[PDB]
């Protein structure tokens, strides 16, 4: 909500072809850098 035109917080936009690869990244993320992600997803073509 209006914070991805700004820079008050950082968002990482990205396309990935598999929700599978999204998972592995989620694992790496949680285990070793703590619990600091908000994971949202939208379907593309």
């Amino acid at each position: 909500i209006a914070a991805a035109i700004g820079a008050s917080v950082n968002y990482v936009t990205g396309v990935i072809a598999r929700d599978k690869v999204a998972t592995l990244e989620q694992i790496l993320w949680r285990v070793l850098r703590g619990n600091l992600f908000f994971k949202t997803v939208e379907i593309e073509q």
Binding site: R30, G34, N35, L36, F37, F38, K39
Partner: protein, 52 residues
């Protein structure tokens, strides 16, 4: 995972961000009290020399 699980972690995120910053901010203001005294003594000793 499920949206609920991801929201438990979300809550954790803003917890981390806040706690490391309070911890940072205590150290930051503690250097500011050492700096007040020291600068104050330095202005004074310089000046009394001039007055002398």
């Amino acid at each position: 995972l499920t949206p609920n699980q991801v929201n438990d972690e979300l809550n954790k995120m803003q917890a981390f961000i806040r706690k490391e910053a309070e911890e940072k901010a205590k150290e930051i203001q503690l250097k500011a009290d050492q700096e007040y005294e020291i600068e104050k003594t330095n202005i004074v000793r310089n000046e009394t020399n001039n007055i002398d």
